């Protein structure tokens, strides 16, 4: 006694190991880039765009 | 407080309506089913059978009950008519074997109901012998059943939820409970008859955690490595060959809040995940164990459930009291996003399942299908779902 909310048949046709040292550096490097871009800004980017327009 | 409860029940109703509106654009398959009793546990059994003359296959789920009153508890096996919805998983050439449709009707029957003593806190089939199921039951006893009780395991002095078979040593079992203890067991099913219930005592007891032991798992490729996580905020790695009185060879302060689950990658022998009350999943390299690889952020409340995909090394699922099951793709870690895309969260958050209207109890990846998950919540609803191949392919 089951409700089928959606069924979409998958037609015919459409796996490398993770290097953990590479994952660790990508995690840390992305965190550096996201603190520089987003955290405690020193000016509002929208201010600059308005003045340059 | 009354207002909080009103607002929460309102928010959930709106969320569920909004989800249903978007289900056609999110999934290739969604099946819902109201169980007679809510279950605390779910696990797909390994077998799938294409049924000749139909548009479905039969696959099976291990469920339990938790009545907590004066009603009888049961270990249950449910049989699901899984519709043939995927060209890749079914041999359609014999055209007695038909393709399923959105208009089709598919059933779920309780195919086996075995009386169980107390809440079924967790149930797992022995990998080497799938007819054998271990449970965590009343007061901390663990129970063994032959589905084609056979034993009771006495050692815990409080109920528990950690339970795992050793995939490289048949009949070897580890358990962890709210008595702060981990017990190791040798379950020889040879002894089993059908008449009597054998009483087994532990082969070893670990007094290494200082709070509730929430989860244990053996390494898939090392018969002596046991991982455990606890409300004491530690992840611990035990060598079962060593003196139990000794400390665990490694104790990792993995989170600063309770750790509810541990999951060891089935393809990458050093990759391990922990799920915590701090709303986060942490990833670890066992070779470099005191420094976290990465933090998976996105859940809005405590994380309790955690299971790697059995088919794809970088794919991980987690569940939370935020009523979501999330699926993460480790290969996307560190990518950049447009501001609009970032509103949905980190790039490695691949998919979110928001169909449940209560706390999620447990989920289980379907081993015989592509990206199919069975998940449970407090309100007796079972969901069997599969995200759109457009998203993950
Ligand atoms: Br590596
Ligand atoms: Br401005
Ligand atoms: Br297991």
Coordinates of C-alpha atoms and ligand atoms in Angstrom, one line a residue:
Chain A
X1 CA 0.0 0.0 0.0
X2 CA 2.4 2.6 -1.4
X3 CA 2.2 6.1 -2.9
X4 CA 4.4 6.7 -6.0
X5 CA 5.0 10.4 -6.2
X6 CA 7.3 10.4 -9.3
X7 CA 8.8 7.9 -11.7
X8 CA 11.1 9.0 -14.6
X9 CA 12.6 6.1 -16.4
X10 CA 16.4 6.4 -17.0
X11 CA 17.0 5.6 -20.7
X12 CA 20.1 3.8 -21.9
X13 CA 23.4 5.5 -21.6
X14 CA 25.3 8.1 -19.6
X15 CA 35.7 7.0 -10.9
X16 CA 39.2 8.0 -9.7
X17 CA 40.5 7.6 -6.1
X18 CA 40.6 10.8 -4.0
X19 CA 44.0 11.9 -3.0
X20 CA 43.7 13.0 0.6
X21 CA 46.7 15.3 0.6
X22 CA 45.2 17.1 -2.4
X23 CA 41.8 17.3 -0.7
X24 CA 43.5 18.8 2.5
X25 CA 45.3 21.5 0.5
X26 CA 42.2 22.4 -1.6
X27 CA 40.1 22.7 1.6
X28 CA 42.7 25.0 3.3
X29 CA 43.4 27.1 0.2
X30 CA 39.7 27.6 -0.5
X31 CA 39.2 28.8 3.1
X32 CA 42.0 31.3 2.7
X33 CA 40.4 32.7 -0.5
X34 CA 37.0 32.9 1.1
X35 CA 38.2 34.8 4.2
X36 CA 39.9 37.3 1.9
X37 CA 36.9 37.7 -0.4
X38 CA 33.9 37.6 2.0
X39 CA 35.0 38.1 5.7
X40 CA 35.3 41.6 7.3
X41 CA 35.4 43.5 4.0
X42 CA 37.4 46.7 4.1
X43 CA 35.0 48.4 1.6
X44 CA 31.6 47.7 0.0
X45 CA 32.1 46.4 -3.6
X46 CA 28.7 47.8 -4.5
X47 CA 30.1 51.3 -3.6
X48 CA 32.9 51.0 -6.1
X49 CA 30.6 49.7 -8.8
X50 CA 28.3 52.7 -8.3
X51 CA 31.1 55.2 -8.5
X52 CA 32.7 53.6 -11.6
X53 CA 29.4 53.5 -13.5
Chain B
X1 CA 7.1 27.7 23.8
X2 CA 3.5 27.1 22.8
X3 CA 4.2 29.7 20.1
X4 CA 7.4 27.8 19.1
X5 CA 5.4 24.6 18.7
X6 CA 2.8 26.4 16.6
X7 CA 5.4 28.0 14.4
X8 CA 7.3 24.7 14.0
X9 CA 4.3 22.7 12.9
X10 CA 3.4 25.6 10.5
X11 CA 6.9 25.7 9.0
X12 CA 7.0 22.0 8.5
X13 CA 3.6 22.0 6.7
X14 CA 4.7 24.7 4.3
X15 CA 8.0 23.0 3.7
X16 CA 6.4 19.7 2.9
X17 CA 4.0 21.4 0.4
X18 CA 6.9 23.2 -1.2
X19 CA 8.8 20.0 -1.4
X20 CA 6.0 18.1 -3.1
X21 CA 5.7 20.9 -5.7
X22 CA 9.3 20.4 -6.6
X23 CA 9.6 16.6 -6.4
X24 CA 9.1 16.2 -10.2
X25 CA 12.2 18.4 -10.7
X26 CA 14.4 16.7 -8.1
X27 CA 14.0 13.0 -8.2
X28 CA 13.7 10.1 -10.7
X29 CA 11.9 8.1 -8.0
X30 CA 10.0 8.8 -4.8
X31 CA 8.0 6.2 -2.9
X32 CA 6.3 6.9 0.4
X33 CA 4.7 4.3 2.8
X34 CA 3.0 4.6 6.2
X35 CA 4.3 1.9 8.5
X36 CA 2.1 0.4 11.2
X37 CA 4.9 1.0 13.7
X38 CA 7.7 3.6 13.6
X39 CA 11.1 2.0 13.2
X40 CA 14.4 3.2 14.8
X41 CA 16.5 1.3 12.3
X42 CA 16.7 0.5 8.5
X43 CA 19.1 -1.6 6.4
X44 CA 18.7 -2.9 2.9
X45 CA 19.5 -6.7 2.6
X46 CA 21.8 -7.6 -0.2
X47 CA 19.4 -9.5 -2.5
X48 CA 17.4 -8.3 -5.5
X49 CA 15.1 -10.5 -7.6
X50 CA 13.6 -9.6 -10.9
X51 CA 10.1 -10.9 -10.9
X52 CA 9.1 -12.4 -14.3
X53 CA 5.9 -11.1 -15.8
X54 CA 6.0 -7.8 -13.9
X55 CA 7.6 -4.3 -14.0
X56 CA 9.3 -4.6 -10.7
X57 CA 11.9 -6.4 -8.6
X58 CA 11.7 -7.6 -5.0
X59 CA 14.2 -6.0 -2.5
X60 CA 14.1 -6.3 1.2
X61 CA 14.5 -4.0 4.3
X62 CA 15.3 -4.8 7.9
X63 CA 13.1 -2.7 10.2
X64 CA 12.3 -2.7 13.9
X65 CA 9.7 -1.3 16.3
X66 CA 9.8 0.8 19.5
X67 CA 6.4 0.6 21.3
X68 CA 7.9 1.5 24.7
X69 CA 4.6 0.6 26.3
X70 CA 3.0 -2.8 27.2
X71 CA 2.9 -3.9 23.5
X72 CA 5.1 -6.5 21.9
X73 CA 8.1 -5.4 19.9
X74 CA 9.2 -7.0 16.6
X75 CA 12.1 -7.4 14.3
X76 CA 10.6 -7.0 10.9
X77 CA 11.7 -7.7 7.3
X78 CA 9.7 -5.8 4.7
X79 CA 9.6 -6.8 1.0
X80 CA 9.4 -3.9 -1.4
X81 CA 8.3 -4.0 -5.0
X82 CA 11.0 -1.8 -6.4
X83 CA 9.8 -0.6 -9.8
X84 CA 12.0 -1.2 -12.8
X85 CA 12.9 2.5 -13.4
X86 CA 16.5 2.2 -14.5
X87 CA 17.8 0.7 -17.8
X88 CA 21.1 0.1 -16.1
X89 CA 20.0 -2.1 -13.2
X90 CA 17.5 -4.5 -14.9
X91 CA 17.8 -7.0 -17.8
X92 CA 14.9 -5.9 -19.9
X93 CA 15.6 -8.1 -22.9
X94 CA 13.3 -10.9 -21.9
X95 CA 10.2 -8.9 -22.5
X96 CA 8.3 -10.6 -19.8
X97 CA 10.4 -8.0 -18.0
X98 CA 8.6 -4.6 -18.5
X99 CA 9.5 -1.0 -17.8
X100 CA 7.6 0.6 -14.9
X101 CA 5.5 3.8 -15.3
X102 CA 4.5 6.7 -13.2
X103 CA 0.9 5.3 -13.2
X104 CA 2.0 1.9 -11.9
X105 CA 1.1 0.4 -8.5
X106 CA 3.7 -1.1 -6.2
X107 CA 3.3 -2.7 -2.8
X108 CA 5.3 -3.2 0.4
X109 CA 4.4 -6.1 2.7
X110 CA 5.9 -7.1 6.0
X111 CA 7.3 -10.5 4.9
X112 CA 8.6 -11.6 8.3
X113 CA 7.7 -10.5 11.9
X114 CA 9.8 -11.9 14.7
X115 CA 9.0 -11.1 18.4
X116 CA 11.7 -8.9 19.9
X117 CA 12.4 -8.0 23.6
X118 CA 12.3 -4.2 23.9
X119 CA 12.9 -1.4 21.4
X120 CA 14.9 -2.5 18.3
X121 CA 17.6 0.2 18.8
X122 CA 19.6 -1.1 15.8
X123 CA 19.6 -4.2 13.5
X124 CA 22.3 -5.4 11.2
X125 CA 22.6 -8.5 9.1
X126 CA 25.9 -10.4 9.2
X127 CA 27.7 -9.7 5.9
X128 CA 29.1 -13.2 5.5
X129 CA 25.7 -14.8 6.4
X130 CA 22.8 -12.4 5.6
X131 CA 20.2 -14.6 7.3
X132 CA 21.8 -13.8 10.7
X133 CA 20.6 -10.5 12.2
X134 CA 22.0 -8.8 15.4
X135 CA 19.9 -6.3 17.4
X136 CA 20.4 -4.0 20.3
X137 CA 17.5 -4.6 22.7
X138 CA 16.1 -4.3 26.2
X139 CA 18.4 -3.0 29.0
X140 CA 21.5 -3.4 26.8
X141 CA 21.1 -7.1 25.8
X142 CA 22.0 -7.8 22.2
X143 CA 20.1 -10.5 20.3
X144 CA 21.0 -12.8 17.4
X145 CA 18.3 -14.2 15.1
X146 CA 18.3 -16.8 12.3
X147 CA 15.7 -15.7 9.8
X148 CA 15.5 -19.0 8.0
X149 CA 16.0 -15.8 19.5
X150 CA 19.0 -18.0 18.8
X151 CA 21.3 -16.1 21.2
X152 CA 21.3 -13.3 23.8
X153 CA 24.5 -11.3 24.5
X154 CA 24.8 -10.2 28.1
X155 CA 27.3 -7.6 29.1
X156 CA 25.8 -4.1 28.8
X157 CA 24.3 -2.5 31.9
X158 CA 22.3 0.2 29.9
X159 CA 20.6 0.3 26.5
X160 CA 22.8 1.0 23.5
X161 CA 22.7 1.9 19.8
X162 CA 26.2 1.0 18.5
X163 CA 26.3 -2.3 16.7
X164 CA 28.5 -3.6 13.9
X165 CA 29.7 -7.0 12.5
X166 CA 33.3 -7.6 11.5
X167 CA 33.4 -8.0 7.7
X168 CA 36.7 -9.9 7.8
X169 CA 35.9 -12.3 10.7
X170 CA 32.6 -14.1 10.6
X171 CA 30.5 -13.9 13.8
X172 CA 32.7 -11.2 15.4
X173 CA 30.5 -8.4 16.7
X174 CA 31.2 -5.0 18.5
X175 CA 28.6 -3.1 20.5
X176 CA 28.5 0.2 22.4
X177 CA 26.0 1.5 24.9
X178 CA 25.0 4.2 27.3
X179 CA 26.9 2.4 30.0
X180 CA 30.0 3.9 28.4
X181 CA 31.3 0.4 27.5
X182 CA 32.2 -1.3 24.2
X183 CA 31.8 -5.1 24.2
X184 CA 33.3 -7.6 21.7
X185 CA 31.6 -10.9 21.0
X186 CA 32.2 -14.1 19.2
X187 CA 28.9 -15.3 17.8
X188 CA 29.3 -18.9 16.5
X189 CA 26.1 -19.7 14.7
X190 CA 27.2 -23.4 14.6
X191 CA 25.9 -23.5 18.3
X192 CA 22.5 -22.3 17.2
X193 CA 19.6 -24.8 17.4
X194 CA 16.0 -23.5 17.2
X195 CA 14.8 -24.7 20.5
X196 CA 16.8 -22.7 23.1
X197 CA 18.3 -19.2 23.4
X198 CA 22.1 -19.4 24.0
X199 CA 23.5 -17.0 26.5
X200 CA 26.8 -15.5 25.4
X201 CA 29.2 -13.3 27.4
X202 CA 31.7 -10.8 25.9
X203 CA 35.2 -11.8 24.9
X204 CA 36.4 -8.3 25.9
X205 CA 35.1 -5.1 27.4
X206 CA 36.7 -1.6 26.7
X207 CA 36.5 1.1 29.4
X208 CA 37.9 3.8 27.2
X209 CA 35.1 6.3 26.7
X210 CA 33.8 8.5 29.5
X211 CA 30.3 9.0 28.1
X212 CA 27.7 7.2 25.9
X213 CA 29.2 5.3 23.1
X214 CA 27.1 6.1 20.0
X215 CA 28.6 4.2 17.1
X216 CA 31.2 1.5 16.3
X217 CA 32.5 0.3 12.9
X218 CA 35.2 -2.2 11.9
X219 CA 37.6 -1.2 9.2
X220 CA 36.4 -2.9 5.9
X221 CA 40.0 -4.0 5.2
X222 CA 41.5 -4.7 8.6
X223 CA 39.9 -7.3 10.9
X224 CA 41.5 -5.8 14.0
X225 CA 40.7 -2.1 13.6
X226 CA 37.5 -0.9 15.4
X227 CA 36.4 2.8 15.4
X228 CA 34.2 4.3 18.0
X229 CA 32.7 7.7 18.7
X230 CA 31.1 8.9 21.9
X231 CA 29.2 11.7 23.6
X232 CA 32.6 12.3 25.3
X233 CA 33.6 14.1 22.0
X234 CA 36.3 11.5 21.0
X235 CA 36.8 9.3 18.1
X236 CA 39.0 6.3 19.1
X237 CA 40.8 3.7 17.1
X238 CA 41.2 0.3 18.8
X239 CA 43.4 -2.6 17.9
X240 CA 41.4 -5.6 19.1
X241 CA 44.5 -7.8 19.3
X242 CA 45.9 -5.7 22.2
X243 CA 45.3 -5.7 25.9
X244 CA 41.8 -4.3 26.6
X245 CA 42.9 -2.7 29.9
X246 CA 45.3 -0.6 27.8
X247 CA 44.3 2.7 26.3
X248 CA 43.1 2.9 22.7
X249 CA 46.3 3.3 20.5
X250 CA 44.8 6.6 19.2
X251 CA 42.3 9.1 20.8
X252 CA 41.2 11.9 18.5
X253 CA 39.5 15.0 19.9
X254 CA 37.5 15.1 16.7
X255 CA 34.8 17.6 17.7
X256 CA 34.1 19.8 20.7
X257 CA 30.6 18.5 20.9
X258 CA 29.0 15.0 21.0
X259 CA 29.9 12.7 18.1
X260 CA 27.0 10.6 16.9
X261 CA 28.3 8.5 14.0
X262 CA 31.5 7.2 12.4
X263 CA 31.7 6.0 8.8
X264 CA 34.9 4.5 7.1
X265 CA 35.1 4.9 3.4
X266 CA 34.6 1.5 1.6
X267 CA 37.1 2.3 -1.2
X268 CA 39.7 4.7 0.4
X269 CA 41.3 2.9 3.3
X270 CA 42.4 6.0 5.1
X271 CA 39.3 8.2 4.7
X272 CA 36.9 8.4 7.7
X273 CA 33.9 10.7 8.5
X274 CA 32.4 11.7 11.8
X275 CA 29.0 13.3 12.5
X276 CA 28.5 15.6 15.4
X277 CA 26.1 17.6 17.5
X278 CA 28.0 20.7 16.3
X279 CA 25.9 20.4 13.0
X280 CA 28.9 19.3 11.0
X281 CA 30.6 16.3 9.3
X282 CA 34.3 16.1 9.7
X283 CA 36.6 14.2 7.3
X284 CA 39.8 12.5 8.5
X285 CA 43.0 10.8 7.2
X286 CA 43.7 8.0 9.6
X287 CA 47.4 8.3 8.8
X288 CA 47.4 12.0 9.9
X289 CA 44.7 11.6 12.5
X290 CA 44.7 14.7 14.8
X291 CA 44.3 17.2 12.0
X292 CA 40.9 17.3 10.2
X293 CA 40.9 17.0 6.4
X294 CA 37.8 19.1 5.8
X295 CA 34.5 20.2 7.4
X296 CA 31.2 19.5 5.7
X297 CA 28.9 22.4 6.6
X298 CA 25.2 22.7 5.7
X299 CA 23.1 20.9 8.3
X300 CA 21.0 23.3 10.5
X301 CA 20.9 21.0 13.6
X302 CA 22.7 18.0 15.0
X303 CA 24.0 15.3 12.6
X304 CA 23.1 11.7 13.6
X305 CA 23.1 9.6 10.4
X306 CA 26.1 8.9 8.2
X307 CA 26.8 6.4 5.4
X308 CA 29.2 6.3 2.5
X309 CA 27.8 5.5 -0.9
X310 CA 28.5 1.7 -1.5
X311 CA 29.2 2.5 -5.2
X312 CA 31.1 5.8 -5.5
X313 CA 34.1 6.7 -3.3
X314 CA 33.6 10.5 -3.1
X315 CA 29.8 10.3 -2.3
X316 CA 28.7 10.6 1.4
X317 CA 25.2 10.9 2.9
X318 CA 24.3 12.4 6.3
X319 CA 21.0 13.0 8.2
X320 CA 20.1 15.4 10.9
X321 CA 17.4 16.6 13.3
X322 CA 17.0 19.4 10.8
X323 CA 14.8 16.8 9.0
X324 CA 17.1 16.6 5.9
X325 CA 19.2 13.9 4.3
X326 CA 22.1 15.5 2.5
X327 CA 24.4 14.0 -0.1
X328 CA 27.9 15.3 -0.4
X329 CA 30.4 15.1 -3.3
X330 CA 34.0 15.3 -2.1
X331 CA 35.3 16.0 -5.6
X332 CA 33.6 19.4 -5.6
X333 CA 35.4 20.6 -2.4
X334 CA 37.1 23.9 -3.0
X335 CA 35.4 24.9 -6.2
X336 CA 34.2 28.5 -6.7
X337 CA 30.5 29.4 -7.2
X338 CA 28.4 32.2 -8.4
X339 CA 26.7 34.2 -5.6
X340 CA 23.3 32.8 -6.5
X341 CA 24.6 29.2 -6.4
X342 CA 26.3 29.8 -3.0
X343 CA 22.9 30.6 -1.5
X344 CA 22.3 26.8 -1.6
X345 CA 25.5 26.2 0.3
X346 CA 28.9 24.7 -0.2
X347 CA 29.7 23.3 -3.7
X348 CA 30.2 19.8 -2.3
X349 CA 26.6 19.7 -1.0
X350 CA 25.3 17.9 -4.1
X351 CA 21.7 17.1 -3.1
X352 CA 19.2 17.7 -0.3
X353 CA 16.3 15.4 0.5
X354 CA 13.6 17.4 2.4
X355 CA 10.6 15.0 2.2
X356 CA 10.5 14.0 5.9
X357 CA 8.3 15.8 8.3
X358 CA 10.0 14.7 11.5
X359 CA 13.3 13.8 13.0
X360 CA 15.1 11.3 10.7
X361 CA 15.8 8.0 12.5
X362 CA 18.1 6.3 10.1
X363 CA 18.7 5.8 6.3
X364 CA 20.3 3.1 4.2
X365 CA 21.8 3.2 0.6
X366 CA 20.2 0.6 -1.7
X367 CA 23.0 -1.7 -2.8
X368 CA 21.3 -3.0 -6.0
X369 CA 20.3 0.4 -7.5
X370 CA 21.8 3.6 -8.7
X371 CA 21.5 6.4 -6.1
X372 CA 18.5 5.0 -4.2
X373 CA 18.1 5.6 -0.5
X374 CA 15.6 4.3 2.1
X375 CA 15.0 6.7 5.0
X376 CA 12.9 6.8 8.1
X377 CA 11.5 9.5 10.4
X378 CA 9.6 9.6 13.7
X379 CA 6.1 9.7 12.1
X380 CA 6.0 6.1 10.7
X381 CA 6.8 7.3 7.2
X382 CA 9.2 5.3 5.0
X383 CA 10.6 7.0 1.9
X384 CA 12.4 5.3 -0.9
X385 CA 13.9 7.9 -3.2
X386 CA 16.5 8.6 -5.9
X387 CA 17.7 12.0 -7.0
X388 CA 17.5 12.9 -10.7
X389 CA 20.4 11.5 -12.8
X390 CA 20.7 15.1 -14.3
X391 CA 22.1 16.1 -10.9
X392 CA 24.6 13.3 -10.2
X393 CA 25.5 12.1 -13.6
Ligands
LIG1 BR1 46.1 9.5 -0.4
LIG2 BR1 26.0 51.8 -3.3
LIG3 BR1 27.3 -4.0 10.2

